[PDB]
RNA sequence: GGCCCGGAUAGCUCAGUCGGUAGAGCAUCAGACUUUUAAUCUGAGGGUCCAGGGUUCAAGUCCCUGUUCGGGCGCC
RNA sequence: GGCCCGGAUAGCUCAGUCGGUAGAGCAUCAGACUUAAUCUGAGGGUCCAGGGUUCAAGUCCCUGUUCGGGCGCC
């Protein structure tokens, strides 16, 4: 399962192939099924079911391919993006700075296309649990179709309604929320009643600024505190050897080197996270 | 649930914090100050507190020329001054982690707490794991990963020197419950280990055999070779770190390696390149930046980076045949 | 002034850019089109135009929703075929109108949110109504250009890294300036701008030429030449240690190199150089260690390199020479914003890519 | 002189210290004069005078200094600092956003310690000019002595008024303009009367995010074009070998490595860049 | 007589002219060791960088005064 | 025929189960070397088109054009 790790793959289960570069693919067991890749062919009832995973599954004209066990960070890049999500940078901060862990409690919304979702029931299991939101019918129906063929529908609940108005759905249980809707600065108030009255933690994800502005004025309105707006910017390095060549001076110390050059020239902006407290007071 | 004697405490006064242990008449030091820790006890976490001449109590002339924004700025910065509030707060991974970045970076090789939370993700720590780390940063990391378990699983922390050093990890006050799922071996049997060739006078005989005994214990959990995870953070370089302790970790499972430098990861990254049995190698580093927002007076104040150190992350999976 | 015929221009679209010349019946191209740039010569600069079939015309310089929760992606919300946009396409319809067809025919558009509609609509005069103006050049936008367009010719010189070489050297009116570069001649433009002709530049050229492609989109009078001048690289050494020495166009252009490359001899022969640039695919060691010495006590030099690794070298084989001060390994980050009510965030972290820069500056030997 | 390079130092100079470290300070050469370093003592009469900069100056005591020849990038670093400044990092950029070269016009507004108004007037040399404006009475007056202290008032001249409500002193004269005020908003208009109706360039230092909103709003409406927000961050490199101890693992590849630590963990905020262009239209 | 310059953070005391100040020693404590009123070896705990105000829309590249230590010229 | 995969950018054509899909080759041009041949170097890039969607963050699918692979009769 995604929540425990399990040696054998079996029939049900979510693997994530590496073709190879940093691309990858997810895709689910099924006996009698079968799956193209760019490195050969798989049939999911001999090259897969019983295998354990991180064997070097061969499939085609000699070709092979690596299987992975399904982590949410894994999760997170092949899934398919019903919306935008927060990748594994963006949400190893922000599950940090909620002090979350086993046995916690957690107020999401919007679910979205469960990129954070599956991230928290991680940490969270076997004993901690989920209330997510999302006002849209077809995303919400979809989530909860991954959480039941994924096996975590035990840590995890869906409600299709309005987080604004309906609040999540429960009172006075919740130790931390997470806000990534366009205007969450409407929900801070259900976000105060959600929370447990003994305290705790807050994180709003929003990509604008004024976004901000409206949602620590409304946060400061409510009585939440240790405001800090942070902003997370990952950096990952293509590593490569290089060799510059002398300069022809007319003579007759210039050695290689290794380095590691940034991907993409410059880093894109995910978005600015406000985060904040709740204490008895 | 509510503060007890001999439970472990954080205590804050604006953004600066320091941990300690409650005792019974236990002077203490902190912000220049000095209390005593007794009267805390029959509260609540997060109770606020101001200095008395001996114990904590519990509570509950040109100034106009300044603007409005600027005189609430004037005002602020002098009534702070002399009159200042500690409060005191349950321990967390969050709070330790940016306590000891700014109190004693250098015992943690300057980790900054953005780049731990990568470690703890990154690495898939969850509970019901087995995991495997090497650290040198006063066990903060290893109180890190124990949050995220929870006493669900297990953890095996390689040492050198005399003994592992878990300093931060008491800070966090676990209970007896998780020290279970701890063992210790000591580093320089490893070579050993792996080619199979590893084996009041009174006071230290009990506590000799005894540690012993649950080093051969942790021996044989290393010995299967079935690990659900590695982490390495230490000031050592972390190459041959890697080509040795990999051996005892099973295919499709995650590893993380910090290091203060760039350089060591560079070779580290190319010696894995060539050895064999891992994918989707990521030399990540993390850039944090906090804000300061107010109406009209909004700006970035600090960009924390290049401190933050660097990482070296990826999968297992089988060597050829 | 005005525009004219002959001139050197630079292209605009909405952030991409491309330097061409203005020659009389010249076909072009440019993000996919086919241009004439007779139509457009006698206009101001900063102009706007629209294409048609060949000539380039001037032109001029609600009900909405809130939330998305119930917008289904159907792709039957545009009621429109893929063949009825190719219809009005081919049938030369100004473009306004065809933004405004879809707009009709989007039968979700009056549901989304205000923001979401004049996104919708940016999505759309992007394509359609195809705006190119005209602009001077300036060491401005040809950075921006070819770090965007040609980033490998340039080694990866971020704009932003190249100001700082213009403000670290000190580059003004009348300096003897020395430079050592093999992006396109760039580095040797941006230079030559903030001289304005006066003072001296001392171009240093491996193989057999100094590039100066870019530096010819700059369009400097003649007047800047008489300050210029140009010597190869393989003869530096000799320099030292003064171990220094149609068959007609053969012998003129031969005896101008010499004729002119005994003169940039001389002027190196004196030592005395207010400064030194370097910015290079080659190794920046040993060019240093040379170059240095035409350089005048107290004066200030910059290197460029793409990595890292190469100036810590550098750092350190300085200081066993000595006769400097200020050493500062830097980069610089940039960070653009966008900036529209209740839509303020950045865009993109520019970093790494950008290039490192070593400076300080020159000081006596010991003896 | 400042504008251009003399071999051999002179009275009414202003010359710079190099006392090690990154530790500098400036001081004018006048007959008869000391300073105190940390070195020792120098006397301005026989270690200055008569001998060229970049040389090794003993102090007395055997210890010894550098001088260096001034520019506005070492000024810039020792000047006396009346108000908060730019450094030669968001200076540099804004020079070449505004196409800067000899024989520009320029208006600034406010002048105010007077660390831009050096490196204006060091491009734009011998031919161009500046227009500054500042209304301090103070800092105007200072700026005013500094200026003919350098010898270099020939390119520039300073005017005591509020630019929000007087303007520049000059209409249709300026090639570009540049802005470090708390309200940069209300000057968009004069700045666009202040300019060459050829066209030109514009620029405004505001940190707080509220004020870039406003004044962009306001450049737009005015009729300005080409709209751009940018924000320079420095990051200096300190060079120091290091070595990092093996693991012993009981065995009776480790090789140093030179390396570039970043000299501040955390680099400051110094503000937001806004700039625009002006075109008959 | 004055004047000028440069430093104060661990319980104490120190870290240079490559832009070398989060680095360390004394003490202390714990292992290891043997020489046991205990030494030695190896490690660990301990860091927000003095006070008091001002200028600057904004200072994490800043000024003035005080406490304290040091350096250097000389009755100006 | 159907189904599932994987790519189109320089005038043309390529880019690897981690040694660059911003990297190059051809052609072209220029120097260098001579008997139009032969070496070196330079100019040349915004990613095939159209539509619908994500927060107001390019992030994802569909359709169409074209090149090629794979399963083998659903
Ligand atoms: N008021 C509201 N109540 C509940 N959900 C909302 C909402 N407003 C917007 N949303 C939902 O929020 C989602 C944001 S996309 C968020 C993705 C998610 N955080 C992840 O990475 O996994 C959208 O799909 C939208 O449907
Ligand atoms: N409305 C106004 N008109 C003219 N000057 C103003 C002004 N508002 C503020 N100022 C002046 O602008 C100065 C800003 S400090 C600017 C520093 C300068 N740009 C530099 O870096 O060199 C202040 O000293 C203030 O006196
Ligand atoms: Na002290
Ligand atoms: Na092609």
């Known amino acids: 399962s995604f929540v425990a790790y399990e040696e054998l793959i079996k029939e049900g289960d979510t693997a994530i192939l590496s073709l190879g570069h940093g691309a990858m693919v997810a895709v689910r067991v099924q006996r009698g099924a079968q799956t193209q890749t760019r490195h050969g062919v798989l049939r999911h009832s001999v090259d897969l079911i019983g295998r354990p995973f991180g064997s070097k599954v061969t499939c085609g004209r000699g070709g092979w391919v690596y299987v992975l066990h399904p982590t949410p960070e894994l999760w997170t890049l092949n899934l398919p993006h019903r919306t935008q999500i927060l990748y594994s940078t963006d949400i190893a901060l922000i599950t940090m700075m909620l002090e979350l862990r086993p046995g916690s409690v957690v107020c999401e919304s919007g679910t979205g296309s469960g990129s954070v979702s599956h991230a928290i029931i991680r940490t969270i299991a076997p004993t901690g649990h989920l209330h997510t939101v999302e006002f849209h019918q077809q995303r919400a129906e979809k989530a909860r179709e991954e959480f039941q063929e994924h096996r975590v529908g035990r840590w995890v609940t869906v409600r299709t309604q309005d987080v604004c108005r309906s609040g999540f759905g429960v009172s006075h249980v919740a130790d931390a929320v997470f806000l990534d809707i366009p205007s969450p600065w409407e929900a801070v108030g259900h976000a105060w009643d959600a929370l447990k009255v003994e305290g705790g933690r807050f994180c709003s994800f929003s990509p604008c600024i004024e976004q901000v502005q409206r949602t620590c004025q409304a946060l400061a309105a409510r009585g939440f505190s ?15 050897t290089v060799s510059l060549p002398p300069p022809d001076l007319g003579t007759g110390d210039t050695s290689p080197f290794r380095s590691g050059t940034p991907m993409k020239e410059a880093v894109g902006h995910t978005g600015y996270l406000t985060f904040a407290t709740k204490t008895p007071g | 649930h509510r503060i007890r004697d001999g439970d472990f405490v954080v ?12 005792q019974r008449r236990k002077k203490v030091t902190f912000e220049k100050q000095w209390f005593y820790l007794d009267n805390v006890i029959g509260h609540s976490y997060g109770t606020a507190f101001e200095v008395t001449s001996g114990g904590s109590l519990q509570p ?9 924004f600027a005189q609430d700025k004037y005002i602020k910065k ?13 321990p967390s991974t969050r709070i330790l982690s940016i306590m000891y970045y700014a109190r004693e970076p250098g015992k943690i090789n300057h980790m900054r707490y953005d780049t731990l939370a990568q470690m703890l993700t990154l690495g898939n720590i969850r509970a019901g794991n087995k995991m495997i780390v090497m650290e040198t940063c006063a066990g903060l990391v290893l109180g890190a990963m124990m949050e995220r378990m929870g006493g669900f699983g297990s953890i095996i922390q390689l040492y050198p020197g005399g003994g592992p050093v878990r300093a931060a990890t008491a800070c966090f006050g676990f209970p007896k419950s998780f020290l279970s799922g701890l063992y210790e071996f000591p580093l320089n049997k490893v070579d050993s280990l792996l080619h199979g060739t590893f084996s009041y006078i009174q006071e230290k005989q009990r506590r000799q055999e ?3 005994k649950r080093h051969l214990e942790a021996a044989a959990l290393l010995s299967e070779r079935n690990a659900d995870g590695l982490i390495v953070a230490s000031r050592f370089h972390p190459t041959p770190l890697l080509l040795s302790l990999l051996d005892f970790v099973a295919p499709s499972r995650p590893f993380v390696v910090y290091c203060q430098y760039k350089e060591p990861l560079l070779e580290c ?5 060539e050895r064999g049995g891992v994918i989707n190698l990521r030399l990540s580093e993390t850039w944090l930046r906090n804000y300061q927002v107010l109406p009209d007076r909004s700006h970035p104040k600090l960009l924390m980076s290049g401190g933050g150190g ?4 990826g999968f297992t999976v089988a060597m050829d045949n």
Chains 1, 4 share one sequence.
């Open chain 1, 226 to 240: 240790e405001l800090s707006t942070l902003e997370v910017l990952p950096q990952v390095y293509n590593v490569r």
């Open chain 2, 11 to 22: 205590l804050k006064r604006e953004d600066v914090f320091k941990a300690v242990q409650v």
């Open chain 2, 60 to 68: 509950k002339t040109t100034f106009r020329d300044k603007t409005e």
């Open chain 2, 78 to 90: 002098k009534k702070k001054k002399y009159e200042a509030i500690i409060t005191v707060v349950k």
């Open chain 2, 210 to 212: 005894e540690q012993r």
């Open chain 2, 269 to 273: 990254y190319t010696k894995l390149r």
């Open chain 2, 310 to 313: 660097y990482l070296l992350s």
